Design a protein around this ligand. Structure first.
Ligand code: FHC
Ligand code: FHC
Lengths: 76, 76
């Protein structure tokens, strides 16, 4: 599986990115019956002013199918 | 944060989807210091014949930047 994480900017060093990836990996292995070798993970830091584009392209159109819906709304 | 999970087709029921979302949520809360309300999660099933397009758009061009690189390769 390929996991993409989008978030607002924060200071995250390589040890912190690796620890995040490890914990995501364990969850994916246990829930999707995956193998470590099949898992890839991207982390993309998006400035808050550009979050509306993520809402419009990714979040809102998929509201009917999201496995976890946001606790906020940004329809413009 | 917005998390997108792309994987091959699988039978997943409502309880399974919600448990996967909750384990992902807690990992994001731990590593990104996020609030529950800011987290959204998508699960997109991709047919195996369409995985090369995911590799070409999301994995290969971002290879060095990935926080977890794939153990497999589509360019051997
Ligand atoms: O959590 C994040 O870093 C983010 F990308 C977006 C977000 C969305 C809604 C909020 O209330 C807070 C942050
Ligand atoms: O894990 C998945 O469900 C997937 F979308 C692709 C994949 C990639 C490499 C593998 O070895 C197995 C599956």
């Amino acid at each position: 599986p390929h996991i993409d994480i989008k978030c607002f900017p924060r200071e995250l060093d390589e040890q912190q990115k690796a620890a995040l990836a490890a914990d995501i990996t364990d969850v994916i292995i246990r829930h999707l019956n995956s193998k470590d070798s099949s898992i890839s993970i991207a982390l993309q830091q998006i400035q808050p002013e550009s979050w509306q584009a993520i809402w419009d392209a990714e979040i809102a159109p998929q509201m009917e199918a999201l496995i976890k819906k946001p606790g906020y709304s940004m329809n413009a």
